[PDB]
Design an enzyme around this catalytic site. Sequence first.
Site, mmCIF file in Angstrom:
data_model
loop_
_atom_site.group_PDB
_atom_site.id
_atom_site.type_symbol
_atom_site.label_atom_id
_atom_site.label_comp_id
_atom_site.label_asym_id
_atom_site.label_seq_id
_atom_site.Cartn_x
_atom_site.Cartn_y
_atom_site.Cartn_z
ATOM 1 N N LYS B 319 57.708 88.866 107.487
ATOM 2 C CA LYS B 319 59.038 88.212 107.697
ATOM 3 C C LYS B 319 58.932 87.346 108.992
ATOM 4 O O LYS B 319 57.948 86.277 109.090
ATOM 5 C CB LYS B 319 60.246 89.181 107.783
ATOM 6 C CG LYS B 319 60.767 89.243 106.152
ATOM 7 C CD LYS B 319 62.016 90.098 106.310
ATOM 8 C CE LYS B 319 62.684 90.078 104.765
ATOM 9 N NZ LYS B 319 62.349 91.528 104.190
ATOM 10 N N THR B 343 42.712 87.936 96.930
ATOM 11 C CA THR B 343 42.147 86.717 96.908
ATOM 12 C C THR B 343 42.177 86.215 98.486
ATOM 13 O O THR B 343 41.175 85.793 99.151
ATOM 14 C CB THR B 343 42.436 85.677 96.004
ATOM 15 O OG1 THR B 343 42.621 86.031 94.826
ATOM 16 C CG2 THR B 343 41.737 84.223 96.274
HETATM 17 C C1 LIG Z 1 42.528 86.586 91.276
HETATM 18 C C2 LIG Z 1 43.223 87.176 90.105
HETATM 19 C C3 LIG Z 1 44.725 87.615 89.925
HETATM 20 C C4 LIG Z 1 45.313 88.116 91.368
HETATM 21 O O1 LIG Z 1 45.313 87.008 92.097
HETATM 22 P P1 LIG Z 1 45.611 87.342 93.931
HETATM 23 O O2 LIG Z 1 46.333 86.232 94.385
HETATM 24 O O3 LIG Z 1 44.269 88.134 94.260
HETATM 25 O O4 LIG Z 1 46.897 88.549 93.862
HETATM 26 C C5 LIG Z 1 45.295 88.131 89.030
HETATM 27 N N1 LIG Z 1 44.701 87.728 87.628
HETATM 28 C C6 LIG Z 1 43.484 86.987 87.426
HETATM 29 C C7 LIG Z 1 42.876 86.961 86.242
HETATM 30 C C8 LIG Z 1 42.861 86.843 88.587
HETATM 31 O O5 LIG Z 1 41.476 86.312 88.623
HETATM 32 C C1 LIG Z 2 62.156 92.051 102.970
HETATM 33 C C2 LIG Z 2 61.564 93.464 102.931
HETATM 34 C C3 LIG Z 2 60.234 93.918 102.504
HETATM 35 C C4 LIG Z 2 59.484 92.947 101.383
HETATM 36 O O1 LIG Z 2 59.127 91.796 101.944
HETATM 37 P P1 LIG Z 2 58.824 90.673 100.843
HETATM 38 O O2 LIG Z 2 57.880 89.488 101.881
HETATM 39 O O3 LIG Z 2 60.200 90.071 100.538
HETATM 40 O O4 LIG Z 2 57.830 91.213 99.680
HETATM 41 C C5 LIG Z 2 59.763 95.099 102.689
HETATM 42 N N1 LIG Z 2 60.359 96.080 103.541
HETATM 43 C C6 LIG Z 2 61.420 95.809 104.375
HETATM 44 C C7 LIG Z 2 62.002 96.810 104.937
HETATM 45 C C8 LIG Z 2 61.896 94.469 104.104
HETATM 46 O O5 LIG Z 2 63.036 93.901 104.828
#
Ligand SMILES: *Cc1c(COP(=O)(O)O)cnc(C)c1O
Ligand SMILES: *Cc1c(COP(=O)(O)O)cnc(C)c1O
Lengths: 461, 462
Positions: B319, B343
């Site tokens: 955030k 990634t």
């Molecule tokens: C890399 C990849 C993901 C996950 O993406 P991230 O951005 O690393 O979370 C999911 N599916 C496939 C097939 C991938 O190659």
């Molecule tokens: C918003 C929030 C998350 C999740 O953040 P995202 O970037 O929306 O995935 C986790 N924990 C708390 C306490 C939050 O307020």
Amino acid sequence: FDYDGPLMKTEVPGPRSRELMKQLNIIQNAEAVHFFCNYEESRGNYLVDVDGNRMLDLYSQISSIPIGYSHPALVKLVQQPQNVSTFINRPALGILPPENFVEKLRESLLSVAPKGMSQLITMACGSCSNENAFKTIFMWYRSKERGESAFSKEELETCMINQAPGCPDYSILSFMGAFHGRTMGCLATTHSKAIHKIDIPSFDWPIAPFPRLKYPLEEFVKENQQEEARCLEEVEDLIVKYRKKKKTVAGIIVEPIQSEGGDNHASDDFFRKLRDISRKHGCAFLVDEVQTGGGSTGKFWAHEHWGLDDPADVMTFSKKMMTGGFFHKEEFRPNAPYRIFNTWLGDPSKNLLLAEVINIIKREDLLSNAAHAGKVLLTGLLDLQARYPQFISRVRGRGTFCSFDTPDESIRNKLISIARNKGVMLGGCGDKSIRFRPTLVFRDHHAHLFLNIFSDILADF
Amino acid sequence: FDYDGPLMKTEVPGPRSRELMKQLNIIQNAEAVHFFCNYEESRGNYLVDVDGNRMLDLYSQISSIPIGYSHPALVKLVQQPQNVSTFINRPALGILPPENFVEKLRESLLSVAPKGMSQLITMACGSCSNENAFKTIFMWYRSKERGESAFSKEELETCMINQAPGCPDYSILSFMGAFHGRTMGCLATTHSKAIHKIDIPSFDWPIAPFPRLKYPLEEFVKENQQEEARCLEEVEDLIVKYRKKKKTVAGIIVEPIQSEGGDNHASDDFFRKLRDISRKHGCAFLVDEVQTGGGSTGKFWAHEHWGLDDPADVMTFSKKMMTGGFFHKEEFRPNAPYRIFNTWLGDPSKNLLLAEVINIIKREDLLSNAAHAGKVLLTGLLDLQARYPQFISRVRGRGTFCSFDTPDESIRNKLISIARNKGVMLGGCGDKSIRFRPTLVFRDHHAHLFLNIFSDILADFK
Ligand SMILES: *Cc1c(COP(=O)(O)O)cnc(C)c1O
Ligand SMILES: *Cc1c(COP(=O)(O)O)cnc(C)c1O
Ligand code: FES
């Protein structure tokens, strides 16, 4: 736009890299680190390290850099004064979208929508794309089962405390060798390498065999048909088995080509039949194009090779796409807000870049270029396979999404390490495969630079 | 820096927003959309919409904008030609980090590391931060149990097919009212609202009560100690119970102030005892500062108020921090690579922004400002509560992280609606609370502007 070839000055990692790796290792495990990079001097197909080494990069940040480094069209975006807000004012996109949100989606993602899929939700990575696709699927399945009826009081009560019937015991069917991400839902569908999985709680969801083709394909026509038929049968059996377990398969997730688990391919026929099994059992068919998507197979989405008007229900993407998200059929649209949601839901800065990326891909005919450059690569790999059967087998690919096997993990890693010192960055997958993920600005002449380097390495190995 | 006040032209959403909403609704459910924005004209605490309304924004993109809109120090970074590459060449940070990666972490996240935590992994959002913190904890717990021993053959085979013993049946303990994200692991720890949870498979993990304090605090000192004591007892019982069920509690996750579930506060004492309970049972203590973190409580991390040298084992953030990630004790360091991985692992461009943000917070003494402006706000809220007890109750806060309750959900939503049309953007949480999440360039004069517009609203409300 690009340098004229690799130029090495030191071993990789060189001394400046090693110093930086020592520093980073104080704050976190740095053992995965290859080397440290000078991205400011990187250009096109070439990654420059902090020791001044210039390598032809055929890994492209795990298949995530779409049109090379420091692309002049992307430089120009960042230079435009009008774009400054987009980089410094990040919105909570689910509640407070920027004026241009829809238009920039029309210029980008909606312009490459898959067939049959009118809906689009954006996410920041591939993992949250698949997680939210799963949830989209589970809400759709439960909505089929209830009509019409409202949420029950029992469902509303039990869901807050992680119990049925509010929290159903549905499953996603996935394949051995798959990789779909590493958050806890994605991970249960991932079956790539033990080190990715070990010590993490999971879900009891069905796991089907993915075909293992035999090469050369023309010499195994019946066997490969039989292998694919066996896998299809086992999928259907698992769906039946899990329905009797009261762990109904709500969706099937698959990659068009398995990446991290070893560049495993299957025929287009296998996929069309898998799609039909999914429909027949009322399973959503979820295609994960995070790695195959964005043009390297010679079509924008790899599933386009299948030739279907209705190729899938949901399709996830990220990496080359700059942003993540998923396309889906209208029928999968969530019925109410705040079910599929998070703070950022991607980032408009990435959609700004992607719209220019997509323009470049169209204007420079880079789909067709990837088919061509990929054929030139594959031909050369086949030549090397014929001259070096003691090191190379199972050469295979589609477009520039190519790979081969070595005899064992130790030779696989040695060949990668020598290539890097000779100016070429290669990726590994599986236990003993070497893979190629060149940027879309990879041309036939770059295929030759690689092949000639690698020919000399194999001669001396 | 800032505009001089709100300027309203239309009802919100106005016609231009409603037209864009209609277009967006074709491709996705757009029913959550408040309105469409002109971020280019937005500045400081003021958000400008596509109908030319300019509103004092006290919600700040769900508490994620740290130093206001269009901050001129951030504009300067995007303008520097040396920074172009950082915006257009996104690395796979786990394998190919940029030259300045470490030094930019020194300028930014490592300069505000919590006590006792020498380790840092970066992540792109709050949910991947929490999922990867859970994993880090599970691996740590199995490491304690197996010692300095290799993975067994059985573990390596079974983990690939989603089976014990390679996949343990360990749990993370969470709290009713919690919000920790919505990916499937996070979501098992989330207990905010039914619509966030329903129809999604979950984990049988323990769920403890979070204390519900009675207000005004001076009149309920004893009852509030008892409520906090009862909650602490039930946490401990649950830990024992889940050990008996072979679903051992590996970690406990908690927010310093519960947000999405309704701005639930508890004493510093309760958190100190909670942390001790964690240690006593060998549970990792995971503090979620995704929403409390970044200064608005008057300290950089809210847990700082507890005054502990060993406040936690792992602390996630996102955030306001622009990037996500988690700090953690040296003992929680993963023992091999490619276990905590993805990634991108964040984005250096967000680190570039964050270093400057942290520079601004320090140079301009913004933690002190949040305590000062937040006292102004809270004092005014208490004054409004005294004058309008039939609309306002349970006024509470720390720094500018304030809230109050209304008699019911329809009044809560009507007051938010009215306030917006009068030039002030407020948040809701739970079924009937209003919350404040002002950016860190919120000053006492903004607090008085709000107070003075809301006073008029209350006088006119039926
Ligand atoms: C890399 C990849 C993901 C996950 O993406 P991230 O951005 O690393 O979370 C999911 N599916 C496939 C097939 C991938 O190659
Ligand atoms: C918003 C929030 C998350 C999740 O953040 P995202 O970037 O929306 O995935 C986790 N924990 C708390 C306490 C939050 O307020
Ligand atoms: S889970 Fe996708 S960015 Fe965090």
